[model samples]
Target: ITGRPEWIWLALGTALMGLGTLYFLVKGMGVSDPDAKKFYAITTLVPAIAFTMYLSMLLGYIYWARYASWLFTTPLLLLDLALLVDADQGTILALVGADGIMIGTGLVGALTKVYSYRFVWWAISTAAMLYILYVLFFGFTSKAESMRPEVASTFKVLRNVTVVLWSAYPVVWLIGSEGAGIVPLNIETLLFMVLDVSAKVGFGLILLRSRAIFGE
Candidate 1:
């Protein structure tokens, strides 16, 4: 795999992106506020598209991982690559959510065949439902505030919180799995849960407090 010419191209592309971002940071020319809003809007659209693609790919993989029917994985992988190429707060969040939903659902489906743990599945589903509700309600409201110049800082904080929480789901799963070497899954899960909850709750409280404390 490392011998492939494509790996060289990938490395080159990544190096160029890093250099560009570094230049932007050094020049203090971060993504403009309006452009950030637009980026977030576009990123939100990615998950809706990705969900459909992932569903199809999951079905294909489950039923055809060994057969020629596995051809769809190529496009799915390409889509993932494209998302990675656009890696930013918005794109990364959407990608994480899309992957989490697909993997979570696939795991639940696979585990159901051997065990009857409706409660586990129900817990996962409920968490997901609540997240979606939160995103829909707060997300649109936050987007609407993008036009307010004075509240741009607030928008940035809110956007960061959303991205953090959304991305944390997959990290939570990873840390809760057996793959997080040297750190027990339980400990990692608890740590991530605490940090994730704190960031979200703290951000919300800060927003509320700003109104009374700063008279905004």
Candidate 2:
């Protein structure tokens, strides 16, 4: 199947993230609500970090920059959800800790030379993600529904979207160069770029569009 040149996808990722960062920053200007301001702050940083990461990818700075980006952004994404549901400090910290484990081990597994060790890290990383999913679905969803019916469905949809996009990353690793080598470098890059935009930019759009978020 034919497609746009791979480099174009990288450039597009960078541009989309750049635009997302700017747009969210400007949109948050008039918000006075503390919660909405927090949303703006998190949303702005989400794509801001993503912008730099995609730029690094375009510039060939590092192959592992993707994980580095997630290390910063994924916590913010989870923080967004936790705050939306007004989760306890313990739950928030737990989610962030697990998220760190997932990203850290994912990077380590990708870089590990020994085939056996690589799978070990992947298993641990996947377990961390499973824990995160459990927290989001079982622990947080009910809180979102009961505490804020206004944003409940919105939160559920966004959480599901995040879950779906996040689940694909491990599979991508299994088939990409870091694992079976079935996916070429360029294709792998394209896949990740697409996923990042969907998970970040798409997330921001859905979130920022909610009237409940801005106190309407």
Candidate 3:
């Protein structure tokens, strides 16, 4: 961190998100309803996992850290699926597969950048993003009728913000990491820091503001 590496912000931002997680964690436990507790507790861990992954990144374990990134994230999506649609085994597997697919593709693209795999990286990322679009909009929207009005609305806000904010990640990676040298590392670092903070901490803040899902 003394070098002010990009991972520095990753660590700092996720740590901030930890506080948000804790805030909701306590609220989640105190809530009278069982379902409310489940919602808060489940979402609370998203930042915690991010915190761990980013901390790993801070210590120079970039690939190792990123490989497991989706482990934490995919749960949130699964949670939405479960809450909004009560996902079955197939649904769970599909979304989780998509998450792993993206992370795997990212690793392939990252390590193989020297092997003229840049476009492959772009293509795979776009493919994964397209699938995510299907899940976020088509998948969720189609299931919206199954959930309560408040939970459905909350799901809409959370899913839309998550997808919208998270959409920037691939752009940064393609430009800053694989931008055909168009995006400098230092510039990419700052841009990534902003996006990470917004996506993680910002997402947590929005999650914290949403009580409808909990049905208090």
Candidate 4:
């Protein structure tokens, strides 16, 4: 959209923040005892995968180290659930099922935003966004437990942060993309930039910190 410095700036934040959290979790916070240490080491990949996946996908591709970078979106979210939570086949089915619905509505709404019939997109995306909030909230409460202590804590903080920060996306989308378009393009860009950083990078750091505390 903006194709501006915000992308580079926020992307830098995401990548840097992800690295920082990874160091803190897998390295800095050392869990003693062989059994716990082994478990901690194993679970390290949960955040490493998720953080690398979504964060890198979200404009983290902008800041190139040199030759190449990485990017991807979902699929691994289910893997994160499998590794971190008590999400069984049934739970995974429902979770991914909800993702399918949101994907459909969100695809339409997302494309519609830049079109003449933005209101249509706005409405569709709104439904998708709201439904996503419900799904996230459900995970926060219902699935917060049934995992390791730190892992559950991570889910709680992660969901709460997601719900709050993510609400701004649709708001900005409605205002700047189509429905009203009351907001400026830069404002919309800035809003999403902040929200993305908060949702992924900030959420990751907070969760890691929580894990550090809980792990000890």
By TM-score, the best candidate is 2
Give lDDT tens digits, candidate 2, residues 186-213.
8888888889999998999999988657
> Per-residue lDDT of 83-190 in model 4, one digit per residue for the tens?
445556765666555555554554465455366666665566457557656866775456657556677777776667767776776676677744476876556656
Model 2 lDDT, full chain set: 0.86
lDDT of 1 by residue, 1-216 (tens): 545443333333334333433432343334344533333333323322323333443344231221121122212322322222233466336644644554455356334644345345535644653564354345544543553443444545554564565455445544443223445543553454344333323333433323211212
Candidates 1 and 4 compared: the better one by lDDT is 4
lDDT of 3 by residue, 77-159 (tens): 45644664565677677766777777777767777736567768767866876786677677876676576776677667777
TM agreement with the true structure for every prediction: 0.33, 0.93, 0.82, 0.60
Best by lDDT: 2
Q: What TM-score does structure 3 among the candidates reach?
A: 0.82
Query: What is the RMSD of candidate 3?
Result: 2.8
| CA-only RMSD, every prediction | 17.3, 2.5, 2.8, 6.3
- Candidate 4 global CA lDDT score: 0.53
Between the candidate structures 2 and 3, which one is better when assessed by TM-score?
2
By TM-score, the candidates rank as 2, 3, 4, 1
How much does candidate 2 score in TM-score? 0.93
